[PDB]
Each structure stands twice: as C-alpha cells, then as structure tokens.
Amino acid sequence: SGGVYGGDEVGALVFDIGSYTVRAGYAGEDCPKVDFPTAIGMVYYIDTNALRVPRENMEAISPLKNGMVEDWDSFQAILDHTYKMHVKSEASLHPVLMSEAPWNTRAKREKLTELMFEHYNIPAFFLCKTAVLTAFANGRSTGLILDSGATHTTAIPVHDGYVLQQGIVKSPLAGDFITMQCRELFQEMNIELVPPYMIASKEAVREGSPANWKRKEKLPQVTRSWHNYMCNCVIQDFQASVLQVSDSTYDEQVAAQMPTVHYEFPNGYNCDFGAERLKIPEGLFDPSNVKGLSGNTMLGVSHVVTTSVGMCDIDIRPGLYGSVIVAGGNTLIQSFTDRLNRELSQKTPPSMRLKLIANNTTVERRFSSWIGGSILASLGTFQQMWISKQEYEEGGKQCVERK
Amino acid sequence: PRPKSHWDYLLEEMQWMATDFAQERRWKVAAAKKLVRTVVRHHEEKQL
Amino acid sequence: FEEWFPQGRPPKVPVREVCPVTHRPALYRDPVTDIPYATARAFKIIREAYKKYITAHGLPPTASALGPGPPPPEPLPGSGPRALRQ
Amino acid sequence: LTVPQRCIGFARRRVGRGGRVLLDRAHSDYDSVFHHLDLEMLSSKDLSQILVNIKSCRWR
Amino acid sequence: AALVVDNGSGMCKAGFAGDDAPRAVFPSIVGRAQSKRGILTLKYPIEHGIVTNWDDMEKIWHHTFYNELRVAPEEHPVLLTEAPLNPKANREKMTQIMFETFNTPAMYVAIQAVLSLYASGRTTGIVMDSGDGVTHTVPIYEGYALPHAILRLDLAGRDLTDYLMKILTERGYSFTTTAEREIVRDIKEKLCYVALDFEQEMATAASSSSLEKSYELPDGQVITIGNERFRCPEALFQPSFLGMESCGIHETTFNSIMKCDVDIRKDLYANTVLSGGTTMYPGIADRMQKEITALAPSTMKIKIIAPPERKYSVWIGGSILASLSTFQQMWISKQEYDESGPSIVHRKCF
Amino acid sequence: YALLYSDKKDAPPLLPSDTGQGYRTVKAKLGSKKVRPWKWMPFTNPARKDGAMFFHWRRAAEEGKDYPFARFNKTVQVPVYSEQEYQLYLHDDAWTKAETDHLFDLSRRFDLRFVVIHDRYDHQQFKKRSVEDLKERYYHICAKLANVRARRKEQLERLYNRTPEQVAEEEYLLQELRKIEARKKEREKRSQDLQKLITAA
Amino acid sequence: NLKTLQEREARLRLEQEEAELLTYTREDAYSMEYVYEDVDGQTEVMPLWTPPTPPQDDSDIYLDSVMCLMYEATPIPEAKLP
Amino acid sequence: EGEVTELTPCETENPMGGYGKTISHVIIGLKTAKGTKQLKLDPSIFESLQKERVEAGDVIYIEANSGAVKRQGRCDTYATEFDLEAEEYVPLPKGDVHKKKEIIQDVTLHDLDVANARPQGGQDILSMMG
Numbered sequence A: 001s002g003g004v005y006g007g008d009e010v011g012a013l014v015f016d017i018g019s020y021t022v023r024a025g026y027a028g029e030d031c032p033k034v035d036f037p038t039a040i041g042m043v044y045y046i047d048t049n050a051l052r053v054p055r056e057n058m059e060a061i062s063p064l065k066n067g068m069v070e071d072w073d074s075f076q077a078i079l080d081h082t083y084k085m086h087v088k089s090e091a092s093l094h095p096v097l098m099s100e101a102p103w104n105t106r107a108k109r110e111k112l113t114e115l116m117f118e119h120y121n122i123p124a125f126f127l128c129k130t131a132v133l134t135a136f137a138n139g140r141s142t143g144l145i146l147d148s149g150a151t152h153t154t155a156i157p158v159h160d161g162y163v164l165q166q167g168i169v170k171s172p173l174a175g176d177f178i179t180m181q182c183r184e185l186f187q188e189m190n191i192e193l194v195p196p197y198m199i200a201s202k203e204a205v206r207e208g209s210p211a212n213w214k215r216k217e218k219l220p221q222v223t224r225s226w227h228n229y230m231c232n233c234v235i236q237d238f239q240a241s242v243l244q245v246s247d248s249t250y251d252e253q254v255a256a257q258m259p260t261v262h263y264e265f266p267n268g269y270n271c272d273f274g275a276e277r278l279k280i281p282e283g284l285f286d287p288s289n290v291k292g293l294s295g296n297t298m299l300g301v302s303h304v305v306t307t308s309v310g311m312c313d314i315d316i317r318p319g320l321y322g323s324v325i326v327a328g329g330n331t332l333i334q335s336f337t338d339r340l341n342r343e344l345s346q347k348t349p350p351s352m353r354l355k356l357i358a359n360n361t362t363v364e365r366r367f368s369s370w371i372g373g374s375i376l377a378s379l380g381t382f383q384q385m386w387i388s389k390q391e392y393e394e395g396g397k398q399c400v401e402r403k
Numbered sequence B: 001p002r003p004k005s006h007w008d009y010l011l012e013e014m015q016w017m018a019t020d021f022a023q024e025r026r027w028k029v030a031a032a033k034k035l036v037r038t039v040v041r042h043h044e045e046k047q048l
Numbered sequence C: 001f002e003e004w005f006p007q008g009r010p011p012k013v014p015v016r017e018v019c020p021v022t023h024r025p026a027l028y029r030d031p032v033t034d035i036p037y038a039t040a041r042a043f044k045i046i047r048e049a050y051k052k053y054i055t056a057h058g059l060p061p062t063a064s065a066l067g068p069g070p071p072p073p074e075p076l077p078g079s080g081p082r083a084l085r086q
Numbered sequence D: 001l002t003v004p005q006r007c008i009g010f011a012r013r014r015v016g017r018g019g020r021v022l023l024d025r026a027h028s029d030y031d032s033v034f035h036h037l038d039l040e041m042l043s044s045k046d047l048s049q050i051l052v053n054i055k056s057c058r059w060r
Numbered sequence E: 001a002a003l004v005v006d007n008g009s010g011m012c013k014a015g016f017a018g019d020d021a022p023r024a025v026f027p028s029i030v031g032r033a034q035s036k037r038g039i040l041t042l043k044y045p046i047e048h049g050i051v052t053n054w055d056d057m058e059k060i061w062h063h064t065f066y067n068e069l070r071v072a073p074e075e076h077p078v079l080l081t082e083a084p085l086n087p088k089a090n091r092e093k094m095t096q097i098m099f100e101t102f103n104t105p106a107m108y109v110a111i112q113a114v115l116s117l118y119a120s121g122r123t124t125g126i127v128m129d130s131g132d133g134v135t136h137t138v139p140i141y142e143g144y145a146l147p148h149a150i151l152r153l154d155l156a157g158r159d160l161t162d163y164l165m166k167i168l169t170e171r172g173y174s175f176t177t178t179a180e181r182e183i184v185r186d187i188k189e190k191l192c193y194v195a196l197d198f199e200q201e202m203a204t205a206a207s208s209s210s211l212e213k214s215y216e217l218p219d220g221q222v223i224t225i226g227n228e229r230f231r232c233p234e235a236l237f238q239p240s241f242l243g244m245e246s247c248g249i250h251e252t253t254f255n256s257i258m259k260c261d262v263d264i265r266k267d268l269y270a271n272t273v274l275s276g277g278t279t280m281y282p283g284i285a286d287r288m289q290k291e292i293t294a295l296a297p298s299t300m301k302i303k304i305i306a307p308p309e310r311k312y313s314v315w316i317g318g319s320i321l322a323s324l325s326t327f328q329q330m331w332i333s334k335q336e337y338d339e340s341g342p343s344i345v346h347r348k349c350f
Numbered sequence F: 001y002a003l004l005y006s007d008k009k010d011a012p013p014l015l016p017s018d019t020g021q022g023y024r025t026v027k028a029k030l031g032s033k034k035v036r037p038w039k040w041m042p043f044t045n046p047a048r049k050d051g052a053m054f055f056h057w058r059r060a061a062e063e064g065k066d067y068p069f070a071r072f073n074k075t076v077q078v079p080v081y082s083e084q085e086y087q088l089y090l091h092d093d094a095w096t097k098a099e100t101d102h103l104f105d106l107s108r109r110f111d112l113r114f115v116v117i118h119d120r121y122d123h124q125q126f127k128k129r130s131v132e133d134l135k136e137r138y139y140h141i142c143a144k145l146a147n148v149r150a151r152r153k154e155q156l157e158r159l160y161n162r163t164p165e166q167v168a169e170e171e172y173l174l175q176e177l178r179k180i181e182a183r184k185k186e187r188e189k190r191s192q193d194l195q196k197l198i199t200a201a
Numbered sequence G: 001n002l003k004t005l006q007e008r009e010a011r012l013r014l015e016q017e018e019a020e021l022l023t024y025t026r027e028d029a030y031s032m033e034y035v036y037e038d039v040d041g042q043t044e045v046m047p048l049w050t051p052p053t054p055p056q057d058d059s060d061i062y063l064d065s066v067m068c069l070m071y072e073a074t075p076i077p078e079a080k081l082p
Numbered sequence H: 001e002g003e004v005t006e007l008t009p010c011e012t013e014n015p016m017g018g019y020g021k022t023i024s025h026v027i028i029g030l031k032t033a034k035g036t037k038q039l040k041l042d043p044s045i046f047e048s049l050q051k052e053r054v055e056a057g058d059v060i061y062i063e064a065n066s067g068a069v070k071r072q073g074r075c076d077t078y079a080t081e082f083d084l085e086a087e088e089y090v091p092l093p094k095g096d097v098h099k100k101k102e103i104i105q106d107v108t109l110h111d112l113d114v115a116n117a118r119p120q121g122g123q124d125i126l127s128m129m130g
C-alpha cells in the first residue's frame, strides 16, 4: 500500500473573504494562519496593528457590501497587502481558491476572475461557493449551511455538493443587528466610549459608579465612521464575552432570577447585565417584539431554515434536515446552538431525522469556509478543475461553465 | 441507474480528506497538550 | 542505604544491529572488523573491505552489495575499532 | 494492538495523507471496561464484556 | 545525542540536547564560503525570520554541523525550529534539504514560541518572542499555538540598533559604518536599558545629569550616553520614534489576546511570558506589566514572567523537548520521509 | 449497547500515530539506508483538456507517471443529437430546439442531476418546468435516439403521484399528525386483538 | 502519610486525563492485517478506509445515498397490472 | 509480575523514636505488557529484593501473602543477539500486573500416599548404592 491515490498539495492559497474578518492561508493546512479585520483604514492600512494607530483621517470602509465585493480598488489593495506581508509569496507562483457567496452576480464574478488573471497573473484559479466549502469542511455533500455572518443569516442548502440557489433565504438578522441593539442599550443605560485608542489610563471604579480616567491629547479623529468602528469593536467584545442567547420563550420570570455576570468597559466602568443580557439575542429567533422595529415582519433562524427547506424539492429535504450545518460567528454565542436545535425540533415535522453537527465546541465554525477550501484544494481529482492561465488567455474567460 | 461520474469520486475523496483533517486537528491538539503537561511535570519533578 | 538499594538508571535498551551486506537481522559479529553480519558471503565481503581499507590509509570508495530499491549507502563509515587481526 | 497487550477500544483503520495508515478510535461504556476486555480476547465487569460485544475483537 | 539548532535571526544557536545552555553561538551570516566577519559578500538569508535563499541556508547548516560542532548529522537527530508563521513551501524545502543533503536519521520542526513556553514551564500564555529581525506574539493554549491569533510586529534589535546609530550620530558620535555599528550594538546590549514612564524619566534626565553614563570605544574615544539610553528601546512601545506606524509590543500583545478565544484569555493574561534577546533590557518587565495593566481590565491579574535566559529560552525549550521521553515517538523517521516525502513534516506536529 | 458508527469523529476520542521512538534501538535499522530524492517537479495531467502544467511532490525516480487521478474523469453517457435529428425525431410543440439544447447542456454539466438542473434551470428564457417533466423529456429523447440508432419505460405519472403525496404528508400539521399516530396505534391494537383471537381459536 | 497518598493519587489521576496512547507501532501494525472470529467461529477481514480506487470499467453504479434515507431497494415482484 | 523499577521514597525516621534515616515504604514499578503499575509494598521485603539479583530491568514473581520475590530473568527486549547465555532472559508478562492464577490438579489418594511416603530434601539421600 503506497497510497498513490492519497492526495495532492499544489499551492492553492485559499482566501476566504468575509464581511467581519478576512481569512487566508495555504492549502493542506487545517487552520488559516492569516486572520485580520477586513475593513481598511482608508485615508490604505489593513492590518490588526496598522488599523489601530492614530493618523490624519483613517476612514474605515468594508469593500464587501452585503457579502458582495463592490470597491475593487480596496479589494485589490487588501489582497496585495495580505500577500506581501503575511504570505511573502509571489502572486504568479501559486494558484488561488478564493470563495464566494451563493448570490454572486455573473458580472461581478467575471470581474473578479479578470482581476485575478490580469493584475496578479496567478498560474490557476477556482472560485467555489462558501456554502459548498462549509459543507466539505464537515464532510457533508447534503445539508443546510446556516450561515450567520456579521451582515446576513442564510440557511443555504446544498445538493450533492451543489448549492440550491433558489433555496437561499437572505435574512437581515446578523451580527450587525446585535451590535446596533447593544449600542442602543448602552446609550440608554450609559455612554458608549472608545477603546483604549484614546483612553490614556484607567482607575479603580466601584461597580455601578461613574468611572474616571485621563484623556489622550492625540489627533481628534474627526471621522465619526472610524469612531463608529472602534465602538463596534468593543460592542462585539461585549457580545462575545457576556451576551448569552435565551433557551426558552424568554419569559420575564426566570431571567430576573438567574446569576449575575460582570463586565469592565475600556475605561474601567464596571456594570452588570444579568437581568437583560439575554434580551438582545431574541430577534435572531423571534423577530416579533424587537424594540428597534416593532412593526417588522422577519423570519427567525428556525423560520429561515424551515423556509429554505420548504422552497426546495421534497426529495432532498430528508438529507437537508438530517445534516443541518451551523456556521458563522453569531453561533459561538452561549446557548445559541442549543436554542436553535430546540426550536428546529419543535418546529420540524416529526418522523424526519434532525441532527445538529457537533462543531460548536471550537471556534473553527468561522473558519469552516477556509477549512473546506483547503480540503478541496488538497484533493487530487480536483486538480483538473482549476481555471488555468491558458483557459483565460485563450479568450474564453468564462467561469460560469467551468466554475 | 447510471455509472459514477468524476464528481461522484471527487466527493468521496473530499469526505475522506475532511475526516483526515478532522482527525489530524485533534491529534495535534492532544499531542501539544501531552507535551506541555509532560514538560511542566518534568519541571516540577526537577524542582522537587 | 546505597548497598541495599543501588538506585541505578534503567538498563539502556541496546541497539538492534543489522547486517550491512544484506540488511537482515545481524546474527554474528566479525571479530577483526567489529561489524555485525549474518551470512558467510557478508563475512567474506566484510573481510575484503577491511583488507582494502587497511591496505591504504582509508579506502576512498565503498564496497557495494545487494542494493535494494532505495539508494544503498554502501557503508564504509561503519568504523571497525578493532585493530589488525593478530 | 500488536506490541501492546491492551484493548484500545472501538477503532477503525483509515488511510491518511502521504500513504500513512491511521487508526481512529471512539468512546463508549466509560472506555474502561474495554481495557479489561483483554482477558476475553486473549483467551459485573465480566459478563458485560461478553454482552456488550460478540467477542468480535480484531486479533493482531 | 539529539541535536538542537534554533534558527534565530542575527545569531544562530546550536548544541546538544540535555545541556542547560547552547554550546555553539555564532552570527547567522554567510559569505560567498565563510561565515565569519570580514570584507566579503556576506549576506543575511534569515533577516526577518524566514529563509530567503536556501543556498546560504544549506551552507550555514553544514557550518553549524561540521565546523562549530564536531558531530555528524547523519548519526544524530536534529531538532529544528521555525517561525510561528513559517510558510508551507519553506518548511517542506527545509525538510527536504535536511533529509537528503545531510542524511539525518530523524528530525522534528517545532514552533519557537512553543519551545520558549516549554522553557518557561507554562501550560498557557502569550509568548512575546522578540528576535533580532522580527517580533511575534503567539498565544498558546494547551500547547496549541492558536495560529489565527498570532500577530507579527516588524521591528526588532536591528531597527533598534539603527535608531541608536541615528540618535548617537545626531548627537555627534561617529556611528555611521558597520565597523561602528558593531560598537553600537555592543552599547545597546550592555548599555541602553529601558526606563518606565518615559514622560517623567526623560524630564528628569534632562534636568539632572545623573542619568549620563560614559562609554569607552576601542579606539580610545569616550562618549556619554544619557536620556537617549531608554529612548532607543522606547520604539518597541512607541514605534513612532523608529519612523514606522505599527503598534507597540504591548499593544500587539493585547490585540493577540483579544483575538484569542473567550473563557481562556484570563489564563493567557496570567502567563504573559517574554522571549528573545531583544527583551534583555533591564526593567522592561515592569514597563510591560504596567502598560498591560493599564490597557487590560483592572480586574484582570496580569503577571509578566521573564526568566534571565530570555535570549536562549528557545534553545532550553528545544533541549527539554529533545530530552523528553514522550517526545521520542514524534521524531520523523527516515523511512517515513522516504515513503511520504517532505510533506511528512506537516503531519506528526504539535 | 453495541459498536459505534461515526463519519468524522466523536467527542473525546483520539487516534494513535506511527512510531518514531527508540532511535537507539533502531539506530542501525535506519542508518544503513538513505532517502529517495523528492523533487518539486512539474506534472501535466492529461485530463486538463488544455496545455496547462502544474507542480507536485514526486520522487525523481518516476519523472514520468503523468497523473494517477487522471483515470477518474469518466464523463456520463449523454447522447449528442444534431439539428436534423431533433427536427425529424425530437420535434415537440411545448418544447423547442433551444430549450432542449439548454436542458442537455445542463445535464452534461451537472452529470444528470435533475435536481440541480431544475435549480439552475433558466426559468426566464423558458417557462417554468418541473423536475419530473425534465426527467420525462430527457428519458424520452434518450429512448428515441437509442431506437433510431438501431432504456426502460419512464412514467411521469408516477412522479406526479409520489412528490405531491409526500409533500402533503410532510405538511402534516402537529394535531393531525398526532391523530394519525393515534390511529396507527389503534390499528396496531386491533391487529394484536386479532392475533389473540386467532391464537385462542 | 494519608495526605501524601491522597495527593499522589490525585497527581497520578491528572496524568491519566491527558492521553492514554498516541502511537501505533508502525513496525508491524502498519503492514500487518487484522482478523477476528465471532462467537460462531466465522472469519472476516478488517476493512481499512482507503481513498476512492481508480475505476477500470463502467462498474460502481451511481447509488445516490441521500435518496436511501427513505428507500431501501427494489423487489422483483410487483402489482403487475395497468 | 513485570519489569521492576525499584525506588525507595525517603521518609522521616521512626516518629516514635529519635531522628535519622528510615524507609516506611518501598515502591516497585512493575511494568507488564499491558501497562505499568507501581506497588507500594511493605518495607520489610527489602531483604528479599537484595537477596536475589533483582535489578532494574528483570521480571520478578511476587506473591500477595508471602511476598517472597523469585526473579524469573531479564527481559528478552535486552537479550542482544551477541550475548551468549540461556535461562537468564524471559519474555515480558502478558496481561495485567495483578494476576489471580487458578489451577486445578487431580491426583488420586494413592498419589498423595506415595508423595508423603518417600522423603525429599537433603539428608544424604543423593547416595546411589544404599
């Protein structure tokens, strides 16, 4: 047994581009060695460190709007900076396996392929969907890829490795909503403050008492959008630290009796949220009484999944319900997976097997797309599907029929 | 009925690679845990 | 305390010698060359190599024998610390 | 296993990258009763080893 | 028996496992042929912690194997080290050249940060590795280096030496050439300590001359270094002095910790360990502790640990790992490489 | 209890790797051999369908061996009819030449995955079609081609009976599904009573 | 002495919670095969999960496993009427 | 039974008397094919250990109640092919360290009669003529 048919590893720099955080890394590896914010400090500074140093303007902008790249200049800048700094690998030295959303337009896809084959001259390229990779990451050919990115929640189903484009449900509920609600709650109870970006030093503060600190005399940073991003940073920190998802219909009788939890703001202001820390992660599943939009009509996570299942043929639903694939950042919140499982079980029609893949223990759910991309690249049979430079220079440059 | 196409074997190889990656991640984690624990135990033993 | 309890290190598990001419489990140890061997042909080749070596300061080439698939090293540097026969 | 004389529990042979063969494992029945099951494969906690399985343990 | 060779930029560190310190330490510079100072075509292949050209790399391998040490690599296993973000191609090529050229019986590649953590004897924490050409903050949990949380800072002892040259030349000292850059580096390693609360330390040094200290050059020249002693290494905390626009070491460490998974960052803060020769500045530990306590929450119990063997901590960790019995089963046997190839270096890690 | 079945991995498990310990024990075992040179050489896969060439880790001893996985590219058996063949045999009223060509292109691209075909089917250029309809059309065309060149009868009515009934079942409300389960339990009780009766006789 | 025994037992327990075994002894297990005998004395070979083998002919008919979730097979006899 | 790793954890002198150096327990690291298991045996057996050539790396045959040590021989793992000796190297024990060997012996009453009839053990019985 020589294992000649094991697999092949030929470059394939996977670049999973995401609205909250972009990911990258070589194929064959299990975890992406590159993970930094996606928003660039456009005056271009794109790095976990460069994006935290005060300068003249440094306006924050995310090239991907609704998961769709629109500002090609900023996208090219991000790619070039990533390569040069983290990878240090020549552009035209290794292929690329960038990922895309299931709702990528044909014109935008062709433009991405052109940018890949013209300014970088990479030896080969292949653009696979994010849901497909997320499914391959879990070794699943059929299932519901419940993406919960920072700007969209979509239960995309896949059939035999192919995404069902008509089954996607782009629910606005996402991390941005949770962050906005947390910002509103803070502004209601206290004043949201910038991270240490401006705080010179903190002091001891009694729980619930006003905090005292020293202001830095650095640049004013008139750009409010940058201040908004710096505040969203702390908002996301709060969300991932203490914010917890309810486990029931969220009646106002049990939450008042649960244990209390603490949290310290950048300035040292200590406050407890044990009473309403689970009020914000409610619209995700029950968007019926959210204070922000009381007269809205949205579908929760379970509702989105049920709709995505129903909009597709019934012949595949047995393989969709039984292989629900939870992914994305929002899911790492405490009790999120359990609440989702409970809601789907009480909602899903009995006699149909419902199984939630046990992958919430680790934070690898975010990187599921990159893991699936690296897995696909490491395959030997897949080595023929790459869009080589010859196929592009020939004149076709048609990724629709080839993908 | 129809014969297995290219993608039919590609998906099997993909599942194989996925389970391989899944096993290898946990193997690396367990090996690293073993190494750190053995090193700290050796340090404590040397001090004792 | 030391006499009744000789706290010595483990026995330092020995090396699993192998025949350099046939790469099989060595069964014997050539006295003059002090290198393990397992067959009479191996012994003859080892004696010839030792004669060629002692002839000059050090044999520039290295005797080859039964080269398997992978590149055989043809071990000359298997130093025999034993001196001349007598 | 071959050199060891202890039952590692439920396992399956699998080929990995580079032609190397791996042996995945699973957890069940506290993972302790199987370590003692060697007395049943070499030849309550005694009948349980015979009931949980049909003595279909892989030799060598 | 098992050899340990740490690919540390600036100066290579090699020796035998089990020893409490490296036996061979020399500048990691090769000229084409000779790896010693002189008027030649010397060049740095590992400037920023990544091998640039493999010719000089194989040359320095042969050197550290046969000239510095007197052991045959084909008879002893070599424990190599790699940067926490070492690309795949470079690791594969290193494994290839090490298995083919020198015919080593076995080898193993380990993250320098994990080796320094072993040397510190901690189960978790952030390894603020600061070589001569690059700096890294590698959070570690149960030995896993958390690659997604690793952040890289592109300043190190080389840039500090350059800035010290610039400052002492502006003050009127002859430090514009390499023959003087060596004396400047000597000053930086011996003199040029770090002082906490620079805003007040510089004021005191300017008001009182007690901080002025004299230095004697080889040619008999004498100069006094004062307030600018700790201004040079201050770039580590305020890269603005160096001219670049990156975050400081403490800010980079805070960012790395924040990127780490929740429910464990407490143990990370509680085990912030320093590493690298660039951390040998006296008093840097207290400055790091204070600035991290200022940044990190007040309720967090920050604890800076920095053994006196910072410069060689990675080598001590490599020696400990090699001497470790349980680690013996992780060596990359020769037959494994022969049957699988250089890709075997990927598997059997961590 | 019984043996376990799992695809990827369980919660606490762990797999053993190979041995590389006891270098002293195996010192001479591996010291008497060398390593076959591995080279980052370029390889050309004949299944590329073009002149592109990539690299791969292989030993220098087999510079040939174009590609092992090349023999996995088995294309599905999809007939390729001409325009005259369609005009003479496959002419239809509801369908048209362009629509049949698009259907066959989708089939060849997705390997007879009618579900993915319908999913990606261009409902704009051509009016809505159902999966069973596409299957019926494809099988009819294949049968006609196989006949004129000189496999099993396809019944769209069956798919017309399976999918809607199964959908109506999947849409069983909670109360009516519980009532159906109760009726099933009652029928089981009646069967048990009949068994008791026939046994007592 | 009782406290020392307790702490020693605790320490030993901690050691058992990291990893029992981590190697496979490739020397023999790598190439050697596995076989067992059931209660009835019947023999069976250990199936090792290998990658997909190269198909030399048109065999290995497409199975569509995802469809088997509700269907098992097709019997020979049927209703046999219009 | 199993490969022995002798070690005596130093303990404070007899607390009933003065001070000095004593040994309250003697730990023997019996290693078997299935695993390792250290036994904190009684210290009085130390005399038996020193009596026989019980060195680290050999197989010993311990008894629960009696405690007498009977070395079987060194482990075959150390039996280098170049070492010329027999009856000194034995294979490692297969199974757990603690083994409860149950053996049944069927002997007729006449067998016991004959066994108890003639003598055994010294007494100049080695004579041939008489």
Ligand SMILES: Nc1ncnc2c1ncn2[C@@H]1O[C@H](COP(=O)(O)OP(=O)(O)O)[C@@H](O)[C@H]1O
Pocket (backbone or CB within 6 Å): A017, A018, A019, A020, A021, A064, A066, A067, A130, A147, A148, A149, A150, A151, A175, A236, A237, A239, A240, A328, A329, A330, A331, A332, A333, A366, A367
């Ligand atoms: N357009 C997108 N497509 C796919 N994934 C996305 C997209 N935008 C964001 N994500 C993922 O969603 C996550 C949002 O992070 P967030 O939920 O705020 O983190 P946490 O809740 O764990 O603190 C990111 O980790 C990112 O990987």
Ligand SMILES: Nc1ncnc2c1ncn2[C@@H]1O[C@H](COP(=O)(O)OP(=O)(O)O)[C@@H](O)[C@H]1O
Pocket (backbone or CB within 6 Å): E007, E008, E009, E010, E011, E012, E049, E130, E131, E132, E133, E134, E156, E157, E158, E188, E189, E190, E276, E277, E278, E279, E280, E281, E311
């Ligand atoms: N006495 C000293 N104190 C602090 N830093 C020093 C001292 N001497 C040298 N250095 C700097 O610290 C660095 C230590 O180098 P090293 O740790 O080998 O780099 P690497 O981390 O790449 O191995 C040197 O390269 C030098 O620039």
